[PDB]
Amino acid sequence: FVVKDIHFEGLQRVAVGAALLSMPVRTGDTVNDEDISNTIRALFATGNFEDVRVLRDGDTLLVQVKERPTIASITFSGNKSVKDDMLKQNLEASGVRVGESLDRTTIADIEKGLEDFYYSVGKYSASVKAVVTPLPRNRVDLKLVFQEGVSAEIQQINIVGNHAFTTDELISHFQLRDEVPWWNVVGDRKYQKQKLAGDLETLRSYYLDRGYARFNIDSTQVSLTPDKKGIYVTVNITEGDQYKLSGVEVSGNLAGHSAEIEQLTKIEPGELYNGTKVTKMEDDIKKLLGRYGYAYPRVQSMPEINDADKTVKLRVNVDAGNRFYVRKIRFEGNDTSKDAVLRREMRQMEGAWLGSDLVDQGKERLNRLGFFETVDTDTQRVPGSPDQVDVVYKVKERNTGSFNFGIGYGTESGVSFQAGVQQDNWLGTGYAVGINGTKNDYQTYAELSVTNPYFTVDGVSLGGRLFYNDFQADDADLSDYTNKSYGTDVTLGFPINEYNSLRAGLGYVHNSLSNMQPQVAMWRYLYSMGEHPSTSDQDNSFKTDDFTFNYGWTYNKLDRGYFPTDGSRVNLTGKVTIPGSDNEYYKVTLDTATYVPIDDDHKWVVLGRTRWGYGDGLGGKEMPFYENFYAGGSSTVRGFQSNTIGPKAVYFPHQASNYDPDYDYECATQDGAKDLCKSDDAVGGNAMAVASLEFITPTPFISDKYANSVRTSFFWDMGTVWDTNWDSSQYSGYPDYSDPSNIRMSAGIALQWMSPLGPLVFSYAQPFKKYDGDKAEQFQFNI
Amino acid sequence: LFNSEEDVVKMSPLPTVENQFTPTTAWSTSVGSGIGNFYSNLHPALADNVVYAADRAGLVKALNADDGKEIWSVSLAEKDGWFSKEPALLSGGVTVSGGHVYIGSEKAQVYALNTSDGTVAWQTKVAGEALSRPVVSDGLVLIHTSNGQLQALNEADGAVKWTVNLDMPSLSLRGESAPTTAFGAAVVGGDNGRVSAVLMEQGQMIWQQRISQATGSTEIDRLSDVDTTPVVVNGVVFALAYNGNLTALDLRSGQIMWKRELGSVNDFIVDGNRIYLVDQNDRVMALTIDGGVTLWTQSDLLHRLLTSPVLYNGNLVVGDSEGYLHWINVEDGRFVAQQKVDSSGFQTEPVAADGKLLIQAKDGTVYSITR
Amino acid sequence: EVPDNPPNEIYATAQQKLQDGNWRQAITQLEALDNRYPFGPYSQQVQLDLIYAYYKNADLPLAQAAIDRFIRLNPTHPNIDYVMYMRGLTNMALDDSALQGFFGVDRSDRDPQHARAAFSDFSKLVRGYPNSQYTTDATKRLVFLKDRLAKYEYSVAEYYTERGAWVAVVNRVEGMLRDYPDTQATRDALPLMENAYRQMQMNAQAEKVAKIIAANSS
Amino acid sequence: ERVVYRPDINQGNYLTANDVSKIRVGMTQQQVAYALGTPLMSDPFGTNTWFYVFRQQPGHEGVTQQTLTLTFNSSGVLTNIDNKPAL
Amino acid sequence: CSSDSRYKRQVSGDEAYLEAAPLAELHAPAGMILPVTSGDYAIPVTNGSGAVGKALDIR
């Protein structure tokens, strides 16, 4: 037989000639019946032809084909929290995907491959059925029933052969404490075989430090409890005996640092063997040789375990590299900010021997940078010299955009709103933009704030802040305390060290007031102003163009730009007045941020946030009441309304405010509340002492897609604001705050939420100790 | 509301509540917290009408086989160890031979409690827990452990004769692979899916025969750990592989007479020429001894988590882990009686002993049944 | 968006929504073209259109993925010069594409990561197709791109001139001269190395660079 | 000026006194490079002038530097061990 | 929805890159010879026949 025409009955990925070429008998080649069967298998060797029926019209071949190709979709059903793409990936481990050859044989290969995966999920009561659903002209949907019944659970690890400790104290020193003996309380358990893999060396490292160099885990028998749930394990171990580290005999290339390498391995001979200390002491040598330039130091300890006295003998084999490994360095991930911004954030320079932590401190400086999401590098050895490593600092930059909002219910009332947005160095410009402002009837506030933090080479933080508060506090007119405040604030930072950086600035505080509030602490500073404005009336205006000089300095040794976990930061900032001011005063403050990790996983770190402030006149004046300090609200003592903690002024017995809202906006005025009302809100202390005691807390029930910058954060908030300029005959039958014995107290949790608009903090705090004129807002809403 | 937070699997519990020979109790005397949540081979035994029963919480009784009153009582709650406390926790069943209640523990001890008081007349350790009830013969206590070790402990005073590893399972699985003495040879299964007869008197391999699959690269039973423990009625070793796959094979060579490598067999007894066997459907089926020729089967038992089919009061008796005792017709699979005497599910087999039907569930410890 | 029609109807609606410019819909035709029906006679032109329509949807690495698809589908094609352009044309827009340019913020001191890769492809054009319609603009890419790649590592060579790492000046300045001793930045990094030796008391080696300034800055 | 508190900058690629004594005028580049490795600066311009040049900034007044050039010929054989300190 | 998608045929909007930047060359003096372009920096110069700008058809 010799074929004159091959009949092609449906191929759909293999071409007409490409099928024909896979036929060992081509059109014109002679047909053998063995070639026909060879046409069957070799078109079965197409990997796309489900069935191949090679016949012939005498010789003229009739190759009737069924087709495997494109699986046009794959459907999952019963695809529970074990994700269907992972169920697709064991299906991809079955060689199956969308747009693929469907051999309809690998159905159970998907299934039993997933059922074996379902075993290694953590379940065993979990099955799966794959369903073929045909789509146009060869195509198929792969529907997939997943019959997942229930999961397995680790119940109790029976560690037999334990002759040094007890099993339960190991389980305590794997994870556990007690459960209500009128003492501490613990949690729950589930199965995974890698937790089994982890605790067995937590078993061994519990042996490796207490002696026990011939501790060995002999065997392990997981109980197949016949339920597919009960995971008990019968583990055979053997402590061998206690062992001692009885001597260090370090040898090899100690690179001329032999005493130092011996000093890291200064041990007690006969001390119970701590193999965990030994490998540490190897790493002590490695960073020693690393900081000595030897980027690749071999250090090989060897405990010659002397069972005859139940000791070990530490041979160490050390071998360092060469010094000048940091030949040059590279910088990647600087597509948005330049190299020299990231390049100046380093302590490791090229043309040097390796300081092993100079790479790391600069990476910690890059961790202290804040224009990042990741800090990484590629410290790659350029081959060709033992003085040759490229450190390719590849990092991921900032996630930008942040918003803050307040509402005055505009366009359903008077057009009233609070704005505010932060650009977080938009596009890595080295221009951090955060701009806010608000327009109500009460105020029409304007503000500007941006800086190039490095605008000149010495770290010129080119920050000019602007403000124009067209603030009136309008009830109907300029009757209750207008203040049109306007001007600028240009401030500059300069690094005095690598973790110490100074600050200095100037303020132009031009205020335009009218009909000020008919009260003591308002007029008392204005009595210190050289004015004597009307006690019983809001008819009193004020124009101050204050020329003020600002200053400060910061400490910065604390980890991360957007989720730190360890270290300390001090942030000095204050102000003072100069000639040309319309008032002579100072105002000094400081902020601190010190992180003490109780958990060494740093899921629980002490975060102490406290605020201090003091200010008075420079002689013959006061610090203004509008610069007197406050607390409450979103402050370090939250659970309050805003401006609750502080001194409480007294309205003079007042008449119309040049317009009194009738039995509204009460200032001891003519309509209501008259005859020496007391200003119940915190009008301000010229001194301040407040604190907030926060903690890192992990979120063990939250999808950690975003928890890298999400910090649930408990607190116990407490403090005072008090005026050292406070009167006490003016405030005789009124709140006196001349002393900081006004220690408020609240407690609760802060909920920092990483949005694409930045971290969003929210609080609930119940104030359980308060002082005069405090107000309480437990449902505390912050940004 | 609160119901909507959980997830389930399926069984079909108690078809055919039957009382045609209406079952009652012979007595009920519950030992304590018995067979437990471990892979357990502890089961009640009834000897001398002095019911040497034990739990896993230490307590070993001798109840009396009329009312279950304590003829003696002890506790294997040892007061020290590497769990800081050592109860009974028995990886072997109750073997009473002589003045010795031999029980193998998950404390790795095979005791031998003196049947007059229950005091440990000897105890000797085995390699970890046992896959096996103590099999006491030839001066030996035959234990096949979870480490696969056919061990031989001196049944009179306690002394290891030969600890011989034969068939440890593929992934250290569990299931009974108890060393049965047949033709002088210890015949062991193995939850590697195999079976082997081995000269018991030193632990010398007569043959080893892989029958069929175990867990590991061919994922099989953890709903019911299949006893590969061979019931060797005569020189055809009758056994199962660990995937349930039944076999009948030579005792001196392991040459297969016939084998069901189709076996979903959970429990299995050779009832004459009719091998009565609990499948994974928890159906009882009478295959032949010269084939898998179904002489009869059962549909009245279906998804029950059964025990082994035993005989008592003229009916095929089988309890289940739903705690329902059943009295099957010894022929074609029909109930005659059915009994819930359990406060539990009967994990252990109905011990049709002393003219009674002794049982002990995990917390439904010792009841005893007549009809 | 993705149709399950016959592919030439999908191809008819493909070349519509390309010339309609419906790249949200045009790609979903061309994807339904070559993925569902991987036997298109236009599946080179579809994958030509895919590199096009991905780039026309500004899907730059997906144009590059369709490039590598077209590298895999048609490595025998007259429009791999297209590919070698659209490779770098991705890697032009893959490298620096921020909105920061209107306000006077540089992006060439920013990394030339894919501008290196664009220089590769626009050289791989003018190597692999030194003749094509795409080869002239790629030659127009390269001599311009070497100067963009000048100003990054010049800002590195100036950085060690800032650092006082004067060995690392010379390792960067000659590192520029090992990279591009034809850009104006290399003439002007040349005094930094001339400074660098001079600060390291290698005034003679510095005055060697002064004669190098006497030649190379000319 | 009068600064008292500053960041401080080192720059290695030096040679120790051991490193000078390992090598000699007449020794090859390689016999130098077996004990010292490469310098982090040489002369591409001119011959093999291997610059192990240390620098350091210890403060406002004064500077720390060890400039050492290892001038090898066209054959790479050492012709100068130019020890030169700061200033 | 304000999110849209449309872009037609051209080389990228840097038409400065149709102009191939004037490179101020560096000839080494004698005895002071420096290395040359290495790495990616290799320009087989062919502005021999070929389209720039919009004329470069991509399809």
End-to-end, the C-alpha distance of chain D in Å comes to: 20
Q: Does D65 touch chain A (CB under 8 A)?
A: no
Whether the CB-CB separation of B174 and B135 falls below 8 Å is answered with: no
Q: Does D22 touch chain A (CB under 8 A)?
A: no
Pair of tokens at residue C63:
């144009």
Mutate to test the interface with E, among D45, D47, D49, D74 (most CBs of E within 10 A): D45
**Cα-based torsion angle of the residue sequence B106, B111, B114, B120 in order, rounded to the nearest 10 degrees:** -90
Please give, rounded to a whole number of angstroms, the shortest distance from the CA of B108 to a CA of chain A.
8
Please give, rounded to a whole number of angstroms, the shortest distance from the CA of E32 to a CA of chain D.
4
Residues of E in contact with C21 (CB under 8 A): 6-8
Going from the C-alpha of B44 to that of each of B52, B312, B346, B360, the distances in angstroms are 8, 16, 11, 6
Quick one: which H or E segment has residue A527? helix A520-528
Residues 6 or more apart whose Cβ sits within 8 Å of residue A21: none
Report if residue A139 sits inside a domain.
yes
Could you list the residue range(s) of the whole structural domain that residue A369 is in? 326-397
* Residue B206: burial class (beta carbons within 10 Å; 0-12, 13-18, 19+): buried
**SS3 label, residue A2:** strand
Q: Does B190 touch chain A (CB under 8 A)?
A: no
Number of domains present in the structure of chain C: 1
**Segments of A559-604 assigned E as strands:** 567-577, 586-597
Report if residue C96 sits inside a domain.
no
Whether the CB-CB separation of B225 and B236 falls below 8 Å is answered with: no
Q: Which CATH number does the domain housing residue A108 bear?
A: 3.10.20.310
Give the span between the Cα atoms of C85 and C94, in whole angstroms: 13
Domain final position from A397, A423, A439: A397
Please tell me the experimental approach by which this structure was elucidated: cryo-EM
Token look-up 């009882």 returns B284
Whether the CB-CB separation of A776 and A639 falls below 8 Å is answered with: yes
Residue A618: HSE in the Cβ half-sphere, 13 Å Cα cutoff: 16
Comparing CB atoms, the residue among D9, D13, D67 nearest residue C202 is: D67
Helical residues (DSSP H) of B6-97, grouped into ranges:
none
Number of domains present in the structure of chain A: 5
Pair of tokens at residue A58:
């005498």
Quick one: which H or E segment has residue B315? strand B315-318
Please give, rounded to a whole number of angstroms, the shortest distance from the CA of A116 to a CA of chain B.
7
Report if residue A361 sits inside a domain.
yes
User: Which residues are bridge partners to A613 per DSSP?
Assistant: A589, A688
- Please give the resolution of this entry in Å, rounded to 1 decimal: 6.7
Give the span between the Cα atoms of A221 and A223, in whole angstroms: 6
Q: What are the backbone dihedrals phi and psi of residue D17, each rounded to the nearest 5 degrees, phi first? A: -70, -30
DSSP annotation of B160: B
- Across the interface, whether the CB atoms of A497 and D5 are under 8 A apart is answered yes
Domain extents for chain D?
Answer: 13-85
Please give, rounded to a whole number of angstroms, the shortest distance from the CA of C24 to a CA of chain A.
20
Give the span between the Cα atoms of A595 and E56, in whole angstroms: 59
Please give, rounded to a whole number of angstroms, the shortest distance from the CA of E4 to a CA of chain D.
51
Q: What are the backbone dihedrals phi and psi of residue A744, each rounded to the nearest 5 degrees, phi first? A: -70, 175
DSSP annotation of D2: -
Give the span between the Cα atoms of A73 and B304, in whole angstroms: 40
Residues 6 or more apart whose Cβ sits within 8 Å of residue A181: none
- Across the interface, whether the CB atoms of D44 and E31 are under 8 A apart is answered no
Q: How, if at all, do strands A687-695 and B204-210 pair?
A: unpaired
Q: Does C102 touch chain A (CB under 8 A)?
A: no
Give the span between the Cα atoms of B239 and B177, in whole angstroms: 10
Domain final position from A189, A205, A238: A238
Q: Could you tell me which of B159, B130, B132 has the C-alpha nearest to residue B147?
A: B130
Which residue of chain A has the CA closest to D51? A351
Residues of A in contact with C96 (CB under 8 A): 335
Going from the C-alpha of A493 to that of each of A294, A549, A559, C90, the distances in angstroms are 38, 14, 20, 40
Residues 6 or more apart whose Cβ sits within 8 Å of residue C121: C84, C85, C87, C88, C89, C91, C138
Report chain D's C-alpha Rg in angstroms.
15
- Across the interface, whether the CB atoms of C200 and D67 are under 8 A apart is answered yes
Report if residue A458 sits inside a domain.
no
DSSP string, A684-750: -BSEEEEEEEEE-B--TTS-TTSGGG-EEEEEEEEEEEE-TT--SSTTTTS---SSS---EEEEEEE
Q: CA C187, C191, C192: angle at the middle one, nearest 5?
A: 110
Residues of A in contact with B39 (CB under 8 A): 223-226, 230, 232
End-to-end, the C-alpha distance of chain A in Å comes to: 85
Token look-up 């003219």 returns B355
Give the span between the Cα atoms of A126 and B8, in whole angstroms: 11
Whether the CB-CB separation of B143 and B104 falls below 8 Å is answered with: yes
Give the span between the Cα atoms of B80 and B102, in whole angstroms: 21
Report if residue C11 sits inside a domain.
yes
Q: CA A565, A567, A568: angle at the middle one, nearest 5?
A: 125
Instruction: Give the domain D13-85 fold.
Output: Beta-lactamase Inhibitory Protein; Chain:B, domain 1 (3.30.1450)
User: Which residues are bridge partners to A372 per DSSP?
Assistant: A397
Could you list the residue range(s) of the whole structural domain that residue C33 is in? 1-59
Comparing CB atoms, the residue among A339, A427, A431 nearest residue C156 is: A339
Q: Does E23 touch chain D (CB under 8 A)?
A: no
Please give, rounded to a whole number of angstroms, the shortest distance from the CA of C4 to a CA of chain E.
22
DSSP string, A89-144: HHHHHTT--TTS---TTTHHHHHHHHHHHHHHHTEEEE--EEEEEE-STT-EEEEE
- Across the interface, whether the CB atoms of D55 and A351 are under 8 A apart is answered yes
Residues of A in contact with D32 (CB under 8 A): none
Domain final position from A126, A150, A174: A150
User: Which residues are bridge partners to A554 per DSSP?
Assistant: A501, A571
Q: CA C74, C80, C84: angle at the middle one, nearest 5?
A: 135
**SS3 label, residue A754:** strand
Give the span between the Cα atoms of A613 and A592, in whole angstroms: 12
Task: Tell whether A201 and A211 lie within a shared domain.
Answer: yes
Token look-up 């006690």 returns A535
Q: Return residues 420-439 of A near C (CB < 8 Å).
A: 426-431
Please give, rounded to a whole number of angstroms, the shortest distance from the CA of D38 to a CA of chain A.
6
Q: Does B322 touch chain A (CB under 8 A)?
A: no
Q: Does D38 touch chain A (CB under 8 A)?
A: yes
Comparing CB atoms, the residue among D7, D9, D18 nearest residue A497 is: D7
Residues of C in contact with A424 (CB under 8 A): none
Residues of A in contact with D29 (CB under 8 A): none
Quick one: which H or E segment has residue A60? strand A60-66
Going from the C-alpha of B58 to that of each of A508, B313, B361, the distances in angstroms are 86, 33, 16
Token look-up 């910090």 returns A711
Whether the CB-CB separation of B316 and B329 falls below 8 Å is answered with: yes
DSSP string, B261-289: TT---SEEEEETTEEEEE-TT--EEEEES
Quick one: which H or E segment has residue A380? strand A378-380
* Residue B196: burial class (beta carbons within 10 Å; 0-12, 13-18, 19+): buried
